[PDB]
Write a protein that binds this ligand. Structure first.
Ligand SMILES: CCCCCCCCCCC
Ligand SMILES: CCCCCCCCCCC
Ligand SMILES: CCCCCCCC
Ligand SMILES: CCCCCCCC
Ligand SMILES: CCCCCCCC
Ligand SMILES: [K+]
Ligand SMILES: [K+]
Ligand SMILES: [K+]
Ligand SMILES: [K+]
Ligand SMILES: [K+]
Ligand SMILES: [K+]
Lengths: 262, 255
């Protein structure tokens, strides 16, 4: 089991890198959010006691808020709109098989949960075959257009790969990031950032849910379908970049430690 | 193409799924929402002063307080959700810089985490590789069919270690139900992560993330096996329709 140690060595080193990466990330987020956290939560204590002494008609303001936060975990106008309607249950399933899972709508029935479990364990693999085919299809659609555009530059075989990938990322980021984010900004009424924030969080299959988007809805899911293929390639390229940088900082430390002051 | 045929299958699968969910949830939806109109008027009637005009104001500000933790630890767990693409959403950035950082952090963290999980998976797959090699030879001197006893051992033990036991731990600790625990486990380790249940809602919180790390490797294999069985069944039903359509009409020749 020689290489098995040569592997465990290499997983452990990656482990500590990720732990570092998270610690670095952890520090940066709480440095960027905890100020806004306190400002928003002192201004909520202001609004509490502004509504208390302006209506002393009281432990039970609380027992309203508990019932409103109990109305949080399910979403004039005493008649509301339907979450689980003909359409939102389709989009819900779409989030389940794509592993996005925004959580804006989630099952509360015990049977719905059990169904959601079985639906995912079968839907996630099934969707993978679709996305794999959609990705393969799109990658070969590119393959034709890139083969056309490279021969017009073969005025070396090696540096034209780089112009190629830049064409790829540029176009894709126009088609799959810029344009649908603009459409969301103009429709969902988001900011220039919240749109691009939504696009990434969705197509990176993270899906927090803080932002979630009858011709509009289908184009969104189909966008998600093809965009997930796009970031699949994008994230895959970034993984290669990292391997390059990782094993070329590995040679650079081998440089230093052998030279180690001349 | 074969992609178009798969496309329509998924569409059909979603339509089937769509119908089943709204049949399972929209009843509870209305029951919960008529009993909220009851509670609204019950609080209007019963507080002549907290009148109609003093209530929606508040609810909008409370649902604006739904919009919103961030301590030494929760920001670590947040980053853990970002690189694992789980993203429960229970805590999400509100600063414009935090969002921009979250974007850059994910585009770099997601690939980085994949290498870890790939190594953790490879490591765990070879740890089983030893234990399974020892349990198969005891069934050989006793073979294409021993593969099947093997995978059943795999799924059983893994479901015990990675699903049953940590769900029980959550049920005692987070005070969940027998289902909500297993519901949480799947939704987390299938990297879906709705957020309706989160173990984060100091010995406990590290073991959870490390559990997630290794469990994600487990369902990675599980979902991968399920993909193969689908590929089998898809190809087995492809031959079966070729069976029917030729035999259908072996008969059609006879006139
Ligand atoms: C507490 C009961 C939980 C039942 C879960 C059954 C899951 C069946 C999975 C079939 C693929
Ligand atoms: C619930 C059992 C059926 C699972 C899906 C079957 C997929 C068949 C694919 C045909 C190409
Ligand atoms: C953010 C840089 C991490 C460097 C890790 C050091 C191990 C070579
Ligand atoms: C199992 C539900 C879908 C069945 C489709 C059969 C493939 C043509
Ligand atoms: C305004 C944000 C631009 C997107 C950041 C890209 C980081 C590589
Ligand atoms: K994934
Ligand atoms: K999610
Ligand atoms: K995910
Ligand atoms: K939320
Ligand atoms: K997710
Ligand atoms: K979520």
């Amino acid at each position: 089991s020689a290489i098995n140690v040569m592997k465990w060595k290499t997983v452990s080193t990656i482990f500590l890198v990720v732990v570092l990466y998270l610690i670095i990330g952890a520090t940066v987020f709480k440095a960027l959010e905890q100020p806004q956290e306190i400002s928003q939560r002192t201004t909520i204590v202001i609004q509490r006691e502004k509504f208390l002494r302006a209506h002393p008609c009281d432990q039970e303001l609380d027992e309203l808020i508990q019932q409103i936060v109990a109305a949080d975990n399910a979403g004039a106008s005493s008649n509301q709109v339907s979450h689980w309607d003909l359409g939102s249950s389709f989009f819900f399933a779409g989030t389940v098989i794509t592993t996005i899972g925004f959580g804006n709508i989630s099952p509360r029935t015990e049977g719905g949960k059990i169904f959601c479990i079985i639906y995912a364990l079968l839907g996630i693999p099934l969707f993978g075959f679709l996305l794999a085919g959609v990705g393969d299809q799109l990658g070969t659609i590119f393959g034709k257009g890139i083969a056309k555009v490279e021969d017009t530059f073969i005025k070396s075989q090696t540096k034209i790969r780089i112009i190629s990938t830049i064409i790829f990322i540029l176009f894709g980021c126009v088609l799959f990031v810029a344009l649908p984010a603009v459409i969301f900004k103009h429709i969902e009424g988001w900011s220039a950032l919240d749109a691009i924030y939504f696009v990434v969080i969705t197509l990176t299959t993270i899906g927090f849910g803080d932002y979630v988007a009858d011709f509009y809805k289908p184009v969104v899911w189909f966008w998600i379908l093809v965009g997930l293929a796009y970031f699949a390639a994008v994230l895959s390229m970034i993984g290669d970049w990292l391997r390059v940088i990782a094993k070329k900082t590995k040679e650079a430390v081998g440089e230093f430690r052998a030279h180690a002051a001349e």
